[PDB]
Design a binder for this molecule. Structure first.
Ligand SMILES: O=C(NCc1ccc(O)cc1)c1cc(O)c(=O)c2c(O)c(O)ccc2c1
Ligand SMILES: [Mg+2]
Ligand SMILES: [Mn+2]
Length: 182
């Protein structure tokens, strides 16, 4: 699903650390980034958003969980759960917010935001993990309308996603990418 031109886009658009992590994640489930080029882009976009989000607040406001190998990710999670007393989640979240003492699940979707927010709530069971969804169109949605970051940090994620959409569109990759979400 997708072109070799989309592979070229991914390698040009995203920094090498994100690209390496994405290639590893895909190969871990027996998929080839040179074939599932759309999924390649989507994974890179989610990783980038998670990292941008973590740089959004104060110094070390957030611990990053996404992008870590599974042992280190759960080490981080178990340590925080042990230290703050918050409930152990059933699945790895993406961040932990020290200010608000909650885990965060980040979603990035090419579909409608309410649909994805609801899918996340169904998978999540923690009932205390906070969900924040972004789209490429500018939509944005969070649990209890609590958007965690200030407007300037969020606008800037939203702008980055916009930019990605536009550059894809100029390359005639957007339609394929848009429809490819599962
Ligand atoms: O599906 C996941 N892994 C398996 C897999 C990887 C690569 C492939 O090519 C095919 C399957 C996965 C794992 C995760 O740890 C997440 O953490 C995750 C996430 O935050 C999200 O906001 C959205 C999806 C997420 C999805
Ligand atoms: Mg994650
Ligand atoms: Mn996520």
């Amino acid at each position: 699903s997708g072109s070799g031109s989309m592979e070229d886009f991914v390698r040009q658009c995203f920094n090498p650390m994100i690209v390496e992590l994405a290639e590893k994640a895909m190969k871990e489930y027996g998929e080839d980034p040179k074939i599932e080029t759309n999924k390649f882009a989507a994974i890179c976009t989610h990783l980038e958003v998670c990292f941008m989000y973590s740089d959004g607040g104060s110094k070390h406001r957030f611990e990053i969980i996404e992008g870590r190998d599974r042992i280190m990710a759960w080490t981080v999670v178990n340590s925080i759960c042990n230290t703050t007393g918050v409930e152990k989640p059933k699945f790895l979240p993406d961040l932990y917010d020290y200010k608000e003492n909650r885990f965060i699940e980040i979603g990035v979707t090419r579909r409608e935001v309410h649909i994805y927010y609801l899918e996340k709530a169904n998978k999540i069971k923690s009932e205390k993990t906070h969900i924040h969804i972004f789209s490429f169109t500018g939509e944005e949605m969070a649990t209890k309308a609590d958007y965690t970051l200030d407007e300037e940090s969020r606008a800037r994620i939203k702008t980055r996603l916009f930019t990605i959409r536009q550059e894809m569109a100029s390359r005639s990759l957007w339609d394929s990418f848009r429809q490819s979400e599962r």
